[PDB]
């Protein structure tokens, strides 16, 4: 396959990337708020436990 | 007051983040997004060859 | 043809998680203000003070009951809302066939919360069930937030897979 | 001719690429459901909890069960699928003769 | 044309099931004049062989 | 803790790859595709003889 | 063919070697109990205490003792174990005939 109109290996790379960025903004937000479940996004039920809690 | 500190170190426990971790996992995610992005570069430039056979 | 039809269920999950993060800062202030609000009741529960310090806890009381109405009234992204009441659910696209992804609505206004734009407290034993009803309806805020924040990281994974 | 009838093999092959290649995309997103659907079901095996925190994570393990189940839906190519359970098996060619590639369906 | 497709000239939506019933009523468009192009394509490869043998 | 340190060491040594040997590896099967696409242009040009025959 | 059969020698010896690591984590747990557990049969052993200091002691005891057995339990690694007594030995690839690397099991 030496096709022109499309690319498979470049879809591979690009959604490696993009997990890769993804892990990369997880992260940094872990580092930048000082917490691993910041929002009910990250864990709605330890969230909601937490603020209880608090 | 001493039962304010427990609840509130309960809540430190269930959430806060270990930053010793988080301290390798930025730079390990800092070189596979680089090495990731050179992956990506070399893998657009698959149909470039085909050029040369005409 | 149906691979080009993927763009709008992806546009459908991102303006679905815009507004599951509207509501979640909206629930973010709403659980501050419940929160002060207990404070506030607890507080007043007790039969030691005087009148005066009673009005101005009943004052404080008021008002941010009144700030919860506001913040949950303000809990829009683009004339659509998840988080007050306005429809029942939100049924976003999944695949180029139609088929959808639905949301159930989960109102935290005071009316969606157990309290109402009147409740208030008179005297001490009203404080003192006040504090039972405001650590009711936090709970359930909480949940309804959790529920939410569930279906805003559903979205993504469907988002990733399509 | 019978060189030239290859091509209907080969694309009949590709296409079976394809299809194990959706499968395989939503089989990872169930594996990570699994996962979380794992940690809650231990976390919530506790006896310490309140009923509240027990709800909560009650609450989380339906609604993966349900985007499992979900998942496991949209896992389509073209109309066919060999991860829902919808067929026992698919043949792909393998000949000009018209001989399979029998690939019994796994269902997830 | 239109007509010959299964829609209308005046074929539109007004609320959002019927853009979930329109969405099912262009994909049988779409099918349809597929099949109908790949008719045609085949009736002119087939005049090209007979003038060849003509 | 300590476990689950272990544990995630040991994932590590049955999964992850060693880009060490990937860095020759790369360079290595670049110059062996151009070296490729150079000997298919090179076989491609058998049919610039027959024609000093006539 | 005989060279490219090396792989699997190599990761065979890596899945020892992280067995064993969390054998030695294991064994350093048991041994700082084992040395508190010496410290309390010692404090325990003087004969002018009275009656309530050695049940605490025993209580001490009898609990360093559940740490170790637990411990002991958990130190699994791909349901293999070599120091919780589960088999009498682990043998491991170290040649691409297929000759073991013997190493015997220690229960901890």
């Known amino acids: ?34 917490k691993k479940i910041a929002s009910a996004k990250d864990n709605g039920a330890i969230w909601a436990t937490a603020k209880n809690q608090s | 007051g001493k039962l304010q500190d427990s609840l509130d170190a309960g809540v430190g426990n269930l959430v806060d983040a270990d930053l010793a971790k988080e301290s390798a996992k930025l730079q390990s995610l800092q070189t596979k997004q680089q090495l990731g992005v050179q992956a990506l570069s070399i893998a657009n430039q698959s149909s470039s060859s085909i050029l040369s056979l005409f | 043809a149906t691979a080009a039809s993927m763009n709008a269920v992806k546009d459908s999950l991102q303006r679905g998680q815009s507004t599951i993060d509207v509501a979640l800062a909206a629930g973010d202030t709403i659980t501050d203000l419940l929160g002060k609000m207990k404070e506030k009741a607890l507080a007043a529960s007790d039969t030691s ?20 109405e506001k913040a949950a009234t303000n809990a829009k992204f683009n004339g659509v809302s998840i ?9 976003f696209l999944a695949n180029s066939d139609g088929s959808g992804f639905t949301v159930n ?58």
């Open chain 3, 49 to 68: 003070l005087n009148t005066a310090s009673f009005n101005a806890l009943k004052s404080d009381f008021d008002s941010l009951r009144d700030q919860i």
């Open chain 1, 1 to 34: 396959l030496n096709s022109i109109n499309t690319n498979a290996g470049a879809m591979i790379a690009l959604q490696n990337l993009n997990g890769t960025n993804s892990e990369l903004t997880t992260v940094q937000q872990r580092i930048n708020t000082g």
């Open chain 3, 105 to 162: 609505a989960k109102t935290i206004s005071l009316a969606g919360i157990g309290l109402t734009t009147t409740s208030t407290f008179t005297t001490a034993a009203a404080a003192k069930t006040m504090i039972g009803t405001i650590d009711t309806a936090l709970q359930t805020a909480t949940n309804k937030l959790a529920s939410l924040g569930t279906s805003s990281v559903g979205l993504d994974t469907h988002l990733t897979f399509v």
């Open chain 3, 83 to 91: 988080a007050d009441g306005s429809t029942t659910k939100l049924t």
